[PDB]
Design a protein around this nucleic acid. Structure first.
Ligand SMILES: [K+]
Ligand SMILES: [K+]
Ligand SMILES: [K+]
Ligand SMILES: [Mg+2]
Ligand SMILES: [Mg+2]
Length: 136
RNA sequence: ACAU
DNA sequence: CGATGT
């Protein structure tokens, strides 16, 4: 089982969990940063991991790219497969933004098609995913 | 347990 | 040490 270097890698970063959430996508081969989301004041790690994958799907579809996406998040990979982010985060005025983005990401999944393989990055064998924030 |  | 998730 070897790395598919022709791929997009995504990851969340946070200050607190729940806390400030951001995410980015990079070229697995080169580390070039391809997209970065502006920090969201309150969210969870898994909401961010989910948004990162969906953004990657949208990014690759817009560019007519068949590359796979790597994520290190078992949870977010499943939520994308299910088209349903089963987050425990309370809905209130302070979490409204992240929940709106999650709802809109689900809505996109329910209205578009993709063949993009969504692959588990095998951290135990390969080290940290290339999109990691270096904060742990 | 496993993955963040 | 705390948290989010299957
Ligand atoms: K990190
Ligand atoms: K990790
Ligand atoms: K746990
Ligand atoms: Mg991650
Ligand atoms: Mg990371």
């Amino acid at each position: 089982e070897e790395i598919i270097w022709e791929s997009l890698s995504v990851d969340v970063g946070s200050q607190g969990n729940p806390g400030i959430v951001e995410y980015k996508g990079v070229d697995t081969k080169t580390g070039e940063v391809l997209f970065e989301r502006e920090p969201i004041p309150i969210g969870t790690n898994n909401m961010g991991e989910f948004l990162a994958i969906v953004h990657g799907l949208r990014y690759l579809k817009e560019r007519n790219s068949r590359k796979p996406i790597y994520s290190d998040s078992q949870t977010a990979i499943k939520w994308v497969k299910d088209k349903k982010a089963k987050s425990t985060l309370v809905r209130n005025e302070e979490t409204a933004l992240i929940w709106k983005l999650v709802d809109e990401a689900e809505e996109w999944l329910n209205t578009h098609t993709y063949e993009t393989p969504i692959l588990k990055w095998q951290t135990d064998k390969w080290g940290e995913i290339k999109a990691d924030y270096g904060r742990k």
